Design a protein around this ligand. Structure first.
Ligand code: HEM
Ligand code: HEM
Ligand code: HEM
Ligand SMILES: [K+]
Ligand SMILES: [K+]
Lengths: 156, 156, 156, 155, 155, 156, 156
């Protein structure tokens, strides 16, 4: 069902962010595991799985609108050096993702592509919930201190 | 356990191939669904999952060898435009991969990283079964015809 | 709840389109069943049932907004003479349905009937998925050939 | 001891079955290599069924103070494509039923009735396989090869 | 397409397995004929084991675009009696392991690591059988033939 | 089966590193239990059992190759005075056991004792996993603080 | 509880006899397995496990009493060359063990260490059961012949 060219472009833009998130979160998940912070590893792994399912729905929407999914042009992964930096990279990644999501919703509404708008809103509702985790985690590090925070995520 | 720099370099290259395969296999899977060849979409999606598991093991082995897993440098996806071509692309990708894996295995045996070798051997055994599948499909196209082949793949 | 007069007009129009698809899809299903293409007959029956369910929701919203649902006036059924013509008649009916669904959604927005917007967005999601199904059958008729496509739809 | 030429027959059949085992097993795996899994599955079972037949003959040969020969392996008729493989099977299957018919006759002359009834039940299995094989070749004509192969991709 | 001499080893290993399938199946049925059912049953499962090794080798050959050789049946080592039987199986198993070892080195050379792994797992399985055979022979020396045969009358 | 002489000399050397490990890990386990660190005790106990299980497999092999298992010689147990030292002591013992394990594999390969090489790769695999556990624990003391790290291993 | 310097000396002595039995009985078990005497190999395996459990209770007692367990100094494993000698090597080893257990029990009583006496007495009961096994087995070899006796221990 021929889609607007600019809708497919926003869609591929969102898709590209999800592909960054997939590789960033999956590497953070495995770094934390290597370090023995198994609870953070498991939680970051599910974030990456979530971004994958988001990617999948975007790929499907694009193909339906007779666009071409772009899985070739991987942007800049924000790999952090240690736990607090890893969280603060996920968060800045997520703040870029939510901005692009809103701009895409704005266009989808202009061109009346209301079903793609709903797909992006659902993805955005989930990214905001990730921001919440992130914000909450960074504030717990300040309240309980890094040594306690890290101890709490040793075990699952 | 500080491992050979060149072993890490090799593992990071195999990982690089798994990352290509993941995105290529996953796109072909969703293209095949878009076209209603739901049985190819199902097989290809499971070829994609399987390469994601391979990446997971390599990212873990690297991290144990105190290497830095490279998930940033994505190679050329080979995306076909029709079923015979999409299968052929995957078989091309798989052939550069089993080669890179034999090269990687040789070096592991020299520096005596026998555990890294065993993992690469296990991956290579996977990729050789994918090659079996792919060769077999393209042969089925000759033997039964492109139309029957596609027909045999509409329904799961 | 006294609801906007133009909102009710739009909803009745959408209901009118559902009432065509119900009858067009049902006759196509039975036509296909009489020709021995039971798999297409079962699919088209379920498309019909789905339009009935959409009709129910519109009928109920219209009554809540104190309008009068119009089940009296029945548009032109687009009946095909053969399988490929019937698929194309469904597709044409659906493209016009999503035209009107978008126009109706634009209005609900402007007059703040956000809940009526949401029902229509859900219907639109269903209808856009039917368009995907129809375009895919038509594409499969090309890839695998009419005779194979019909053979594939003999048994359930 | 038991009659001598009987043990010579049982050992001719046993040699047939040993040809069949290897031929059907190799065919079966060729079909799987090619992705024709339903033919593979069915040929594998013809292999298994011939192994069972060989088993029962070996047991009877020994009971007759005979010596089972498993060293003298005939010529296998290995086909290069599906229609050839079926015809090779059918050729082998027809020599094997002729040989079986000769053995059975010698059994009835020397009054070895239990060796006969064993050979009959084998010959019943081999006539079943001949029906299967004739049917398959007939279907290739009725539906065309490309279709006949499509119907044996999946199990 | 697989390396020329790899496929020749694989057919070599395959040929030894085909000798083992038959040798073990016949010993098995002689031990049963004699009433040594525990040895019969053990020797049957060694036969079945080699059939699985045969199968995995035919599938690998075909994958490599080679031609599996099931025609050329080598020399079967039969025994007149329990002690020769076990020693024949042991001699075959000793030719078998030498060849496997040779084949593995070629695979390692050309870099066919997957065919190596497969032969390694056959070897592992053949060393196991060698352990069983030496252990059995050991036990005839430790407990005496008449007893070791008593211990393998029943299952 | 008659086996090479310097192969058996190696297995008995690996075996000797296992016999040392059995005793060292069991004592570290029982010490941690007595200090109330029941989680370290439990884990070190299963490390001991694993070494017991490797030893049984090495003995099984030597007797098959008609060597003579050497359970009589027993090198120096490295018994730590504190948790960190006990971890380090295990870690030193493991790195030597892998140094020697590799040397055993090299020779096994060169004389075509391919089954014995497989056993040592497996042992080697299991030892590298213990290194990861050890490296990780020592790292975790840096990250969460020694007080938190011992606290975290009070309870099971 | 600060224990008596000589009680600890006695516990480490018994612990030494148990560390010998472990290794002697284990290797004896595997020897009997290699020769196909599975019943002997199994029963001997359990004797070995039994001693491992005795040794565990000792180390725990030593540590509770604030001594140092001695797992470093291993004595003379008595390895027979055949079934009949293996059984006698075992019998000779238990007889040295039950001497040392009685002297140790005398001393625990002299210093009012009733709990250590009970542990040791429990070990002593067990070793006396092993003696009755061994006495009965050697006597069985007499009444049936080494040939029948070994026949009777081929199968578990
Ligand atoms: C470095 C890249 C990736 C890695 C390491 C990775 C890893 C994984 C793993 C380990 C699993 C679960 C394994 C299992 O099912 O047993 C998984 C599931 C999945 N992956 Fe990936 N993945 C990657 C990239 C992607 C991409 C690019 C996509 C699609 C855009 C994707 C889509 C999915 C989906 C849809 C699932 C199933 C999720 C579910 O429903 O549970 N993955 N991935
Ligand atoms: C003299 C030749 C042979 C004899 C007497 C023989 C006998 C048997 C028997 C009685 C069975 C049990 C089947 C059942 O009752 O379900 C069997 C199974 C089997 N045979 Fe054979 N066989 C022979 C040769 C072969 C060969 C040459 C191959 C392969 C190259 C082979 C492959 C197999 C396989 C894969 C099985 C199934 C094993 C399992 O997974 O259970 N056999 N054989
Ligand atoms: C050459 C020395 C040893 C060998 C070959 C050996 C072997 C074994 C094996 C195979 C098991 C079975 C584990 C399982 O399957 O879960 C076991 C259990 C055990 N071992 Fe050892 N072991 C040795 C030394 C020791 C020592 C020195 C100790 C004590 C300091 C010990 C304490 C134990 C304990 C407590 C168990 C658990 C037994 C049970 O409760 O069932 N082992 N051993
Ligand atoms: K704390
Ligand atoms: K007896």
């Amino acid at each position: 069902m021929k889609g607007d060219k600019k809708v497919i472009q926003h869609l591929n833009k969102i898709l590209g962010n999800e592909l960054i998130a997939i590789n960033q979160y999956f590497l953070h998940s495995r770094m934390w595991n290597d370090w023995g912070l198994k609870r953070l590893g498991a939680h970051e792994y599910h974030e990456s799985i979530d971004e994958m399912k988001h990617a999948d729905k975007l790929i499907e929407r694009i193909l339906f609108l007779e666009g071409l999914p772009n899985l070739q042009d991987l942007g800049k992964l924000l790999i952090g050096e240690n736990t607090q930096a890893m969280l603060q990279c996920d968060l800045n990644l997520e703040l870029k993702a939510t901005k692009d999501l809103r701009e895409a919703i704005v266009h989808c509404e202009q061109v009346h592509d209301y079903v793609s708008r709903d797909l992006l809103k659902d993805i955005l509702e989930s990214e905001e919930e990730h921001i919440d985790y992130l914000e909450t985690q960074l504030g717990l590090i300040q309240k309980v201190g890094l040594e306690n925070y890290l101890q709490s995520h040793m075990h699952e």
